[PDB]
Every structure is written in structure tokens, then in C-alpha cells.
Enzyme design. Sequence first.
Site, PDB file in Angstrom:
ATOM      1  N   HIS C  99       0.748  -1.284  -0.094  1.00 58.33           N
ATOM      2  CA  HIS C  99       0.134  -0.015   0.051  1.00 58.33           C
ATOM      3  C   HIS C  99       0.895   1.342  -0.146  1.00 58.33           C
ATOM      4  O   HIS C  99       0.408   2.292   0.218  1.00 58.33           O
ATOM      5  CB  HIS C  99      -0.882  -0.037   1.437  1.00 58.33           C
ATOM      6  CG  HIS C  99      -2.075   0.634   0.887  1.00 58.33           C
ATOM      7  ND1 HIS C  99      -3.159   0.652   1.502  1.00 58.33           N
ATOM      8  CD2 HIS C  99      -2.556   1.559   0.032  1.00 58.33           C
ATOM      9  CE1 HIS C  99      -4.247   0.819   1.058  1.00 58.33           C
ATOM     10  NE2 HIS C  99      -3.855   1.633   0.016  1.00 58.33           N
ATOM     11  N   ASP C 122      -9.754   0.023   3.402  1.00 54.85           N
ATOM     12  CA  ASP C 122      -8.727  -0.732   4.142  1.00 54.85           C
ATOM     13  C   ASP C 122      -9.208  -0.947   5.259  1.00 54.85           C
ATOM     14  O   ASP C 122     -10.027  -0.328   5.946  1.00 54.85           O
ATOM     15  CB  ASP C 122      -7.762   0.273   4.184  1.00 54.85           C
ATOM     16  CG  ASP C 122      -6.180  -0.555   4.553  1.00 54.85           C
ATOM     17  OD1 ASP C 122      -6.207  -1.657   5.145  1.00 54.85           O
ATOM     18  OD2 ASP C 122      -5.103   0.120   4.072  1.00 54.85           O
ATOM     19  N   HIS C 124      -6.874  -1.095   7.529  1.00 57.52           N
ATOM     20  CA  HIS C 124      -5.756  -0.481   8.035  1.00 57.52           C
ATOM     21  C   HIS C 124      -5.979   1.159   7.930  1.00 57.52           C
ATOM     22  O   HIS C 124      -6.653   1.206   7.071  1.00 57.52           O
ATOM     23  CB  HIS C 124      -4.345  -1.033   8.123  1.00 57.52           C
ATOM     24  CG  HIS C 124      -4.411  -2.505   7.665  1.00 57.52           C
ATOM     25  ND1 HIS C 124      -4.914  -3.285   6.839  1.00 57.52           N
ATOM     26  CD2 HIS C 124      -4.317  -3.200   9.125  1.00 57.52           C
ATOM     27  CE1 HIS C 124      -4.687  -4.663   7.263  1.00 57.52           C
ATOM     28  NE2 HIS C 124      -4.551  -4.430   8.718  1.00 57.52           N
ATOM     29  N   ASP C 126      -3.061   2.909   7.629  1.00 51.71           N
ATOM     30  CA  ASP C 126      -1.800   3.065   6.946  1.00 51.71           C
ATOM     31  C   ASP C 126      -1.300   4.308   7.291  1.00 51.71           C
ATOM     32  O   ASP C 126      -0.909   5.174   6.608  1.00 51.71           O
ATOM     33  CB  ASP C 126      -1.833   2.625   5.319  1.00 51.71           C
ATOM     34  CG  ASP C 126      -2.227   1.130   5.165  1.00 51.71           C
ATOM     35  OD1 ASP C 126      -2.217   0.421   6.419  1.00 51.71           O
ATOM     36  OD2 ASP C 126      -2.762   0.672   4.143  1.00 51.71           O
ATOM     37  N   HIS C 139       4.373   0.284   4.246  1.00 46.04           N
ATOM     38  CA  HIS C 139       3.057   0.057   3.481  1.00 46.04           C
ATOM     39  C   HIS C 139       1.968   0.436   4.426  1.00 46.04           C
ATOM     40  O   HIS C 139       1.109   0.811   3.948  1.00 46.04           O
ATOM     41  CB  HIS C 139       3.116  -1.287   3.204  1.00 46.04           C
ATOM     42  CG  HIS C 139       3.177  -2.426   4.262  1.00 46.04           C
ATOM     43  ND1 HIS C 139       2.176  -3.042   4.762  1.00 46.04           N
ATOM     44  CD2 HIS C 139       3.962  -2.532   5.033  1.00 46.04           C
ATOM     45  CE1 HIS C 139       2.430  -3.552   5.929  1.00 46.04           C
ATOM     46  NE2 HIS C 139       3.630  -3.515   6.310  1.00 46.04           N
ATOM     47  N   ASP C 230      -7.635  -1.039  -0.656  1.00 38.72           N
ATOM     48  CA  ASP C 230      -6.629  -1.924  -0.085  1.00 38.72           C
ATOM     49  C   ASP C 230      -7.415  -3.247  -0.098  1.00 38.72           C
ATOM     50  O   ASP C 230      -8.387  -3.167   0.437  1.00 38.72           O
ATOM     51  CB  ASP C 230      -6.250  -1.589   1.249  1.00 38.72           C
ATOM     52  CG  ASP C 230      -5.092  -2.728   1.840  1.00 38.72           C
ATOM     53  OD1 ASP C 230      -4.910  -3.498   1.068  1.00 38.72           O
ATOM     54  OD2 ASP C 230      -4.765  -2.294   2.965  1.00 38.72           O
ATOM     55  N   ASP C 232      -6.961  -6.120   1.951  1.00 38.51           N
ATOM     56  CA  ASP C 232      -7.392  -6.671   2.920  1.00 38.51           C
ATOM     57  C   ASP C 232      -8.638  -5.963   3.475  1.00 38.51           C
ATOM     58  O   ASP C 232      -8.847  -6.379   4.885  1.00 38.51           O
ATOM     59  CB  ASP C 232      -6.200  -6.584   3.856  1.00 38.51           C
ATOM     60  CG  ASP C 232      -5.527  -5.385   4.211  1.00 38.51           C
ATOM     61  OD1 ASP C 232      -6.099  -4.301   3.990  1.00 38.51           O
ATOM     62  OD2 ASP C 232      -4.568  -4.943   4.754  1.00 38.51           O
ATOM     63  N   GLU C 275      -2.074  -4.785  -1.856  1.00 38.67           N
ATOM     64  CA  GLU C 275      -1.715  -5.943  -0.905  1.00 38.67           C
ATOM     65  C   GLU C 275      -2.253  -7.025  -1.369  1.00 38.67           C
ATOM     66  O   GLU C 275      -2.517  -8.131  -0.720  1.00 38.67           O
ATOM     67  CB  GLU C 275      -2.284  -5.330   0.425  1.00 38.67           C
ATOM     68  CG  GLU C 275      -1.948  -4.035   0.966  1.00 38.67           C
ATOM     69  CD  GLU C 275      -0.466  -4.177   1.357  1.00 38.67           C
ATOM     70  OE1 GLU C 275       0.392  -5.253   1.187  1.00 38.67           O
ATOM     71  OE2 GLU C 275       0.142  -3.272   1.689  1.00 38.67           O
TER      72      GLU C 275
HETATM   73 MN   LIG Z   1      -3.734  -0.719   3.255  1.00 43.27          MN
HETATM   74 MN   LIG Z   2      -4.732  -3.163   5.032  1.00 43.02          MN
END
Ligand SMILES: [Mn+2]
Ligand SMILES: [Mn+2]
Lengths: 213, 316, 316, 216
Positions: C99, C122, C124, C126, C139, C230, C232, C275
Site C-alpha cells: 500500500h 482498508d 488499516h 496505513d 506500507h 486495499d 485486506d 496488498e
Molecule cells: Mn492498506
Molecule cells: Mn490493509
Amino acid sequence: VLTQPPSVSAAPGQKVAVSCSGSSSNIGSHYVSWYQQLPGTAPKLLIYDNSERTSGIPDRFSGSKSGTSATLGITGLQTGDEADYYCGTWDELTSNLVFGGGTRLTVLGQPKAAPSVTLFPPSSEELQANKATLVCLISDFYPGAVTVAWKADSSPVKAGVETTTPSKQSNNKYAASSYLSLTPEQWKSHRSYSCQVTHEGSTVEKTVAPTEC
Amino acid sequence: MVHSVAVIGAPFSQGQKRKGVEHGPAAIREAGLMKRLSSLGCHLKDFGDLSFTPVPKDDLYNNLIVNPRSVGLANQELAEVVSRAVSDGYSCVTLGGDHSLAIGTISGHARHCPDLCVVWVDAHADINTPLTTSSGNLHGQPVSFLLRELQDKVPQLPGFSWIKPCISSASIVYIGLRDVDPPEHFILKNYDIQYFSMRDIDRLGIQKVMERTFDLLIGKRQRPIHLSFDIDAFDPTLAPATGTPVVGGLTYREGMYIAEEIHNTGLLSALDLVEVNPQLATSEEEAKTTANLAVDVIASSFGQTREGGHIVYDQL
Amino acid sequence: MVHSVAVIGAPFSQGQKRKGVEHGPAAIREAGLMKRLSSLGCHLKDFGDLSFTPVPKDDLYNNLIVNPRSVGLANQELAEVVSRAVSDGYSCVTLGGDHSLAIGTISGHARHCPDLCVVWVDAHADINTPLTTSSGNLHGQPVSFLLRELQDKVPQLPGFSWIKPCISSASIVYIGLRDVDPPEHFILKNYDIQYFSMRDIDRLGIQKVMERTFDLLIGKRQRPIHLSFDIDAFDPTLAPATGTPVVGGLTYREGMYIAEEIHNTGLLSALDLVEVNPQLATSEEEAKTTANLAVDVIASSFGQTREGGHIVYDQL
Amino acid sequence: QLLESGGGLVRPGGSLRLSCAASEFTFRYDYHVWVRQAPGKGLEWVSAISGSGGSTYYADSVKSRFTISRDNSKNTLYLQMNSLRAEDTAVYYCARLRADLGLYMDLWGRGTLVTVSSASTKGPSVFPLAPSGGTAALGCLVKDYFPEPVTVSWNSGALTSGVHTFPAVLQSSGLYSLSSVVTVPSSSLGTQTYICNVNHKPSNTKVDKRVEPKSC
Ligand SMILES: [Mn+2]
Ligand SMILES: [Mn+2]
Ligand SMILES: [Mn+2]
Ligand SMILES: [Mn+2]
């Protein structure tokens, strides 16, 4: 019911096309599969619906159909490819699945060793029992294809002849046998007998007489 | 006339890769269908599986690859068996192979119930016309023989001259579409058929969907209901053993809800459960779990519940 | 300037356990990306995969374990390739590895579109700073180089002196968070970045989420949109082949909805899909299904639909 | 995988029963066929059965003598063979039959041998092939033995280097003959003994044969 020619030839790295001819009621009208008979094994499916490969088969293999005929292209020829290839489809006149007779593809990656030939006359034991066999032993030949002619003096003999199909040897060369049955009197009455073996169009011919050694 | 329940096996398909669909009734029968229904206090009448034999050549090849004339003509025999079953006061369950049987079962129903409406649960609209998809698609093409506004665009295939369009565009509601061809997409739009795609369910909810659905079907008058539930409407993780598994579909919860709702109107007259194909499963588990789901749908539609039912006055 | 579509492979990562992420563009390319897009009537321009070669030692070991200077500097080459692609009137799709590429693609976009906004889909955020996570996390740390309020807390790593913060805290909305460090959690709070965590989606709904999202981004003026999706973000059952799979994430339905919505504004300018790591899959099926999902996201964002589209006026 | 069995030697007029054990749980949903291969001829489809055994199809070649059956409960296909002739002698193969644009057989078995020969069990007459290139080849002729195999040693395997035994010929009668041959140097003949020990375990027939008739 389907016609495909019997044999094919090349050295590793080259390419061929096995052709399958049929009719209206099958190829003109139905889909064609292609099956590889590795010698001494059950066949394996290569291609259905004329050109559809199955998994893991490389793209070296290609099938194609046109009206009343079909054709299996194979490129970048390899050892372990050499085998029997059959076409198959459904015939809508007789209501069955039909195959071609097969085509044997040999890949020549080994040299044209002509056959070693040993010919034995009838044994004392056998003649004593009122019988006579001549034995022709054929070995270390490549490729695995031969043709045999017996001759009593100068006359050809096809009666009482039994010839084996070629077999593979330890070294991936081939071995065959041929047996001529005579009466003891036929054996004793002729000046000589000869086994004539032809390999890739060249002849080897061994000779025996009733006079000993 | 939905007082009791009839079970009819109709193992029809066109063959080719999707020929294990003819094995669906046994799979569902083998999911313990009849127990459930019997144990839901229903008077049942098991009318067996129908003969499916190709016309006019019953040699091997045709069995593997069947002609359209053979299906259209097996639907005629089906409409007749559905018709008589309704006529004797039964709710029709038809365990299916391919969604084409819908042609014979809706035609059968219409016959003794001409004010019927249809809820088509499916990822597909199965509403192509003979000239919009391949010879092979007749399972994904059965609604253009029933709808009465499509006959200008629908030709007379042999086996299909008996079909008499028994639904207007305003009597069918679709739930669960996610795989719709442009031909189909235009038809839905052009003839003003209402439908709830997976998008409209993300937005509206399965609760509001069923609310909106009933208003459009039975909102100003009570009619007999024909649930044509297609198994590929459930997300493939729930229903893997099917010919055209499309991702993003109904949860188990959404699907039972739909069934639960249809039952709760007490108007359900006939039910179709189709596209159950065990040959396409990764395992026996996958084949079994798909048919288990299919037994739940029916069970729900006929009174099964997730919170209790039935009778008790318990001891001490 | 989003009239047509550009496909750019950027196989970047820091190596170590998550080095199969550099193989993502091929995996997506191999999910039939370009077909879909071509068959969505898009004029496409495939700009290929970028050179990713470590600085300043391209010996074996560095390839397996890459230094930050090497990424920051490959993002510079990326911002340039994104920039020119926007400048020639294209919508950017950047197939990713980690990412972190978001640093180069947002920097590129900002450059010819300085009023842009960002939707960061996402699990996350990030959004760690160089001093809040390990050398390895770049990332999971790219948003503190772009945001313009974080430069007081963000040091000058070599490879990163070209980055010029091109987003205020009020131009980025997060969808789908469930794995947020305390450092990140405080930043979101402290600088008043709005976000919709998996909790807010359980509560609000993906429908209301997107509604609230657009109001906060494009509510009082039209801006160009930068979707940094992203992989995930999808629940791991849907997207297993990824480095930090966190449970409880978007359904397939939620994810397409988001894409569907972004497309429906017709403002989408650039899209990042990152990712995707096939080395981390249990099978080829798992690797393939993850990339299939990733092709759907893009397809949706560029006009794919679950209920039809396109053109027809059908025959008889 | 598919795996066939219960092939063997049956006498003309005889009966026999093949099994095919399939692995797939989808075996019960799928047509299977029987194809046989006469020795080094082509392939001939013999019979085919439906997933349920409601429909059987037979070749004119085998119809009314042969009966195809299956037991899905046991994941087994069967072939009952009656009124068997020489011309039925073939390797028999089960296969799965499936459809797409046309019909193809996608899964196959290893095969199983059916030999239908009139000939009864017996042992062979052994005869020496005396010797008459510096080296010589001497041997033993193993004549009219039924059925296969014969197991052969020269000086009980002690003689190993240069021993050559050919694949036997199947005679027109149905009775087998093979030739055994060893290559030796011409000095060696007198001093050391040459015997081809031979075994027809079927008949429990063992023959030790001395090879000295060079007469020179
Ligand atoms: Mn990400
Ligand atoms: Mn992620
Ligand atoms: Mn469907
Ligand atoms: Mn359907």
C-alpha cells in the site's frame, strides 16, 4: 469406420499431422476426440470438441476439423511422445461411438542398428521324435520394425511360419523371433534353408544345411 | 388448491456439462425432504419422478445431448401433472433439474388458477428469447414463453406450440439478480417488469424487499402465489453444487426470510426448486449441504420457523 | 483527466515475509483485467510494470530485503508516470504490491489535480509516521507523507524529500477500519480525519456510509476522486491471499457497493488496488479468487453492474 | 482413478465377470462405458450404461452375450460375459462418458486381460540349440507350452552374462514356443557344462537340458 493412416516418423524437435477421415454421419456432423495410447498402457484423453485441450497437455498439441475430416498437429517432437493415436466421434447412422484404427508414431532419437540374426537347424532330439523346427533369432535392431521371408533353396515358404512382433530390449533396441515347422524329410531333401529379415528396406539372410557344423 | 402437498420430480436438462442436474430430485429426496414435510404436519402425496426420454431419437448421444423439442414436450407432460395435482386440492412442490421446468409448472398452475402471480428467486432472470441465446440456454430462457407481452418476439419451436402465455409483466417480481445479459436487461426495462437485484437488497433490506414485493403482487387483491426458487440465488459458499454459481448472493438468513414471508401470506400454491446439480460439487459434503439448504427453503415456505411452532401443554 | 483508462503495474514492497506482493499486478493481469475493462467499452492504455531496483546496492540480499530509500525513490518514478497519464486525459488504475505506492500515485494525481479528495478503503489506516512504526512498515505508514498537518511530526528520510503533502485531514475518508494502532487512533481523533470503521458499518449500513462519505468530500463542490482500495478491507474468507488478513471485514456485496457508488458519481480520476500477495494463498484457487475479486472492484468502479448495462434493440 | 479386474483365461463357450472400481463420489452421476482392444488391433466400444442403470447400450459385436451393470452403493461397474470366443480375446477398459459440444471419455482405467483360447494346460518339449565372429551362440528351444510363462536359467543363474531369451510366439493353435540363447567363446566348449534349466510352474514341470551336439 474412421480412417487414419497406420504409422508416422520424425527425430525429436520436429512436427507431424495425424489425419482422420470419416463421413456425413460422424465427422461431417459430430465432434472428434484424440486419445494417446502410450505403449502397454490404457489410453489418455488429449482433445475433445475438435481442438479443446485437457489440463497439463502442452499447446504443442492442436486439433482441427473440416467437413468430413480431422487432424492432430504435434510440434517440438519429444521422446515419451512416441505412441498410438486414435480419433473418436459419434456416427448418427449406426448409433454408436466409432474410433479410427489408430496411428503408431515412433520418434527416432536412436541410430538405425540393423538386426543381429542367429539361425539354428532342427535338433537331433526333435528329428528323433519325427519333427523339425528352424529358429531365427533377431536382436539389437532400431527402429522396432522388420519383415521376414523363409526360402527352401530358392523357393519362398509362408506355410508353417510363426513370427513374433518386435519387443523392446534392455538397451531400448528391439528383439524378434520366427519359427519354420518342417517334416524331417522336407529338412533332409533341400540343400539349404534361409531366414531373410528386412529392416528399414535392407535385408539380412542367414542359411543352414542338414550337414553338421 | 393448496390444502395439502404434492411432491413431483422433474429431472429435465439439455445435457452437456450441466447433466447432473437430472439427479437433483434424488439428492433433495435424499436430504430427507418428505420426513421434514411429514413432520410439519402436512398431508403429502408423492407423485414420483417423470419420464424424460428424447424426441424423436432415444439413442445414447441424444440422452447426453438433448434437443429443445424434447424439453418443450416433457414440459407439456409436466403442465398436465401439475394441473391435475392443483385440480385435486394440493400445493405443488416440483424438485427440479434445470430452471426450464418452470415452463411446464407455471403453465400447469395458470390452467386451474388464471389470476396467479410469480416470485422468481434467482441470480438470473432466465428471460432470454429463443433468438437471444444459444440452443443450449433453455434453462436460462423459460420466462419469454410464459410472459404474454413477449409473443411478438418469440418464435414457434416444435414442442412449444401448446404453451399459452399465462403471465403479464406486472404479475412477476424477481428477487436476487446479479448476472443479467444486455438482451435480458433491456427486456426488464422496456416492458416494466419490477425486480430487486442484489444491489437493491444491499440498499433496501430483505425485510423492505418482501414488503415492496407483496404490495406489487397481492396489494389490492389476494391471488395464488407461484414461488419459482432457483438454487443459484444463494451465495455459492452456501450453494456450491449448481451449474452457474455467481458470487455475492443471498445469505442463508436472506433466503429463509423470503421463504418465511411467502408462507406467512398463506397464499403459496406451487413451489419450484431448481438447478441442484450434485456432479458439480467439490465433495459429497458440498452436494449434501446444497440439498440440505434446498430442503430448508421448502420446509420454510410450508411453515418451518427458526423460533418454534406446533403444539405443547407440558407435564410435571 | 478520466476520459479513458491507464493500467500501470507498480510491484513495490520492502521484501521480508511480504515479498510475493510484487507479483500482484501479474495475478490481476492474469484475472483477465484488461478483457473486462476492454469489454466495458473503455479505451485502455497499458503502461506496463515499473522497474523496481534497490538503491544504492542491487545485490541479491537487498532485493530480498529492501531499504526505505529504495521505495521512496520508486514512488518518485511512479508520481511522474501517474502525473503524465493524468496530463494526457486518462483515469489511473495502479495494480499494486504494498500500500506504499499510494505515496507515488496520490503525489502524481495531486500534481495535475490539486483539489482532489481520497476514499481509503482498508482494514488499516496505513497512517503511522516513520517514528511510530518499524523500518518494515512503510506500507502501513504512507498517509503521513501526504497529509499536510503531519509534517511537524514527519522527518526527512532520504528518497522522500520530493514528497510534497497534497492532502488536508478534511479531504480523506476511511472506510472499513478494524485494526488500528494507538498511535494511528490518536492521530485520526486529534486531527479530525472522518472515518467509518466496521463498527460504524454494522450500525449505519454501506448505503448510509457512502451517503455520509460523499457529503463530506464532494458535498458543496465537485472534486476529482482518488480511490485507494486495499484488498485486506474484504473479510479474509473473500480475500485470503494478503499479508495482514484481519477478520470481520467487508462482504463481497459491501465492496462492490462502494465501487458501484464511486463510479456513480462519475468523478473517479485514479484507483489503487493493493496488498494482493499470491505467495500467501492456501492454493491456486485462493490466489485466483482473490485476484478475481480485485478485477470485480475495478470493473465496478469503471461501470460494471450486477443488474445489466450497455446497449440492445433485440430481433424476432 | 478407474481400476478394472477379474480378467483371466476362459475356455471357448465360457463365462467371466469384470469389475471396475471408480474413486469419484460423482461416479454415480455419470455414464461409463466399456472399450476393448484385441491384441495390437484398435479400440472397439463394447457397451455403455447411464448413471442410474435405467439405460444400457451394446455393440452389435457383443450384444445379448454381454450385460453391463453397476452398483452405485459399491462405486462399481460390472460386465458379465457369456458365450465367449477367440475373437473376444482383448484388454477390457472402463471409462467415464461426458458431454460438452460433443462426447469425450475423460477418465480411464489400466485395463484387464481376457484370453479366450481352446488350448488346455501342458508342459513343453525342450530341445538344445547346439553351436556349429569368434564367439558362439548356443541355446534351448521351448516348444508347445500352455499357457505362459516359462521361467528359464542356465546353470541355475550362475550363467548370467550374455543370456538372451526372446518373447514367445503365440502359434495359430493357441500353443506357445520361445527360444533361449547365450553367447560364449569357442575355446570354452569342452571343459565346462552348458545346461538351460527350464520351469513350467503351472504344470509343475522342470526340465534341465545339456547342450553339446557341435560334433566338431
Ligand atoms: Mn492498506
Ligand atoms: Mn490493509
Ligand atoms: Mn440461476
Ligand atoms: Mn434460474
